[PDB]
Amino acid sequence: DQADKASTRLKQLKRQLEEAEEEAQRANASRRKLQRELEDATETADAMN
Amino acid sequence: DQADKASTRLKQLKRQLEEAEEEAQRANASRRKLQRELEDATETADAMN
Amino acid sequence: NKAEKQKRDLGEELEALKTELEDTLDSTAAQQELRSKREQEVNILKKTL
C-alpha cells in the first residue's frame, strides 16, 4: 500500500511538473516579447537624445 | 524497495518542483517590473507625439 | 535455511542499486555492452565452478 500510495503521489507530482514547465515556457516567452519591445524603445530614446 | 525507490523519487520531484516555483517568482517578478518600464515608454510615446 | 534467506536478501540489494541506475545504463551503451558481457561471464564461471 505504501508503494501504491507513494507511486500514486509520485505520478501526481509529474502532472504539476509538466504544467509548471508550460508556465515557465509561456512566462519566459512573454519576457522575450517584452524585452524586444523595450529594446526598440531604448533605441528610439537614444535617437531622440 | 519500490516504496523506498518511489519515495526517493518523490523527494527529488519535490525539490525540483520547488526550484521551478522559485524560478517562476523571479521570472514573474521580472515580468511585472518589465511591465512598469513598458508603461513609461507608452506614456513617453504620447508626449513625443 | 537462514543462510539461504540471507543470500536472497543480499541479492535484493544489488537489484535495488541496478534499478536506480537503469536510467543511466541506456545512455552509457558505448561501454555497457562490454561491461554487461563481463557480468554474464562471471556468473557462468561461478555456475561452472
From Swiss-Prot, chains A, B:
Full-length numbering of the shown residues: 1863 to 1911 of 1960
Post-translational events: ISGylated.
Domain notes for this protein: The rodlike tail sequence is highly repetitive, showing cycles of a 28-residue repeat pattern composed of 4 heptapeptides, characteristic for alpha-helical coiled coils.
Protein family membership: Belongs to the TRAFAC class myosin-kinesin ATPase superfamily. Myosin family.
Highest taxon of the lineage: Eukaryota
Localisation per UniProt entry: Cytoplasm, Cytoskeleton; Cytoplasm, Cell cortex; Cytoplasmic vesicle, Secretory vesicle, Cortical granule; Cell membrane
UniProt gene name: MYH9
Protein's job: Cellular myosin that appears to play a role in cytokinesis, cell shape, and specialized functions such as secretion and capping. Required for cortical actin clearance prior to oocyte exocytosis. Promotes cell motility in conjunction with S100A4. During cell spreading, plays an important role in cytoskeleton reorganization, focal contact formation (in the margins but not the central part of spreading cells), and lamellipodial retraction; this function is mechanically antagonized by MYH10.
Organism: Homo sapiens
Record disease entry: Macrothrombocytopenia and granulocyte inclusions with or without nephritis or sensorineural hearing loss: An autosomal dominant disorder characterized by thrombocytopenia, giant platelets and Dohle body-like inclusions in peripheral blood leukocytes with variable ultrastructural appearance. Some affected individuals lack leukocyte inclusion bodies on classic staining of peripheral blood smears. Alport syndrome-like features of nephritis, hearing loss, and eye abnormalities are present in some patients.
Oligomeric and partner information: Myosin is a hexameric protein that consists of 2 heavy chain subunits (MHC), 2 alkali light chain subunits (MLC) and 2 regulatory light chain subunits (MLC-2). Interacts with RASIP1. Interacts with DDR1. Interacts with PDLIM2. Interacts with SVIL. Interacts with HTRA3. Interacts with Myo7a. Interacts with CFAP95. Interacts with LIMCH1; independently of the integration of MYH9 into the myosin complex. Interacts with RAB3A. Interacts with ZBED4. Interacts with S100A4; this interaction increases cell motility.
Tissue: In the kidney, expressed in the glomeruli. Also expressed in leukocytes.
Designated name of the protein: Myosin-9
Lineage, opening ranks: Eukaryota, Metazoa, Chordata, Craniata, Vertebrata
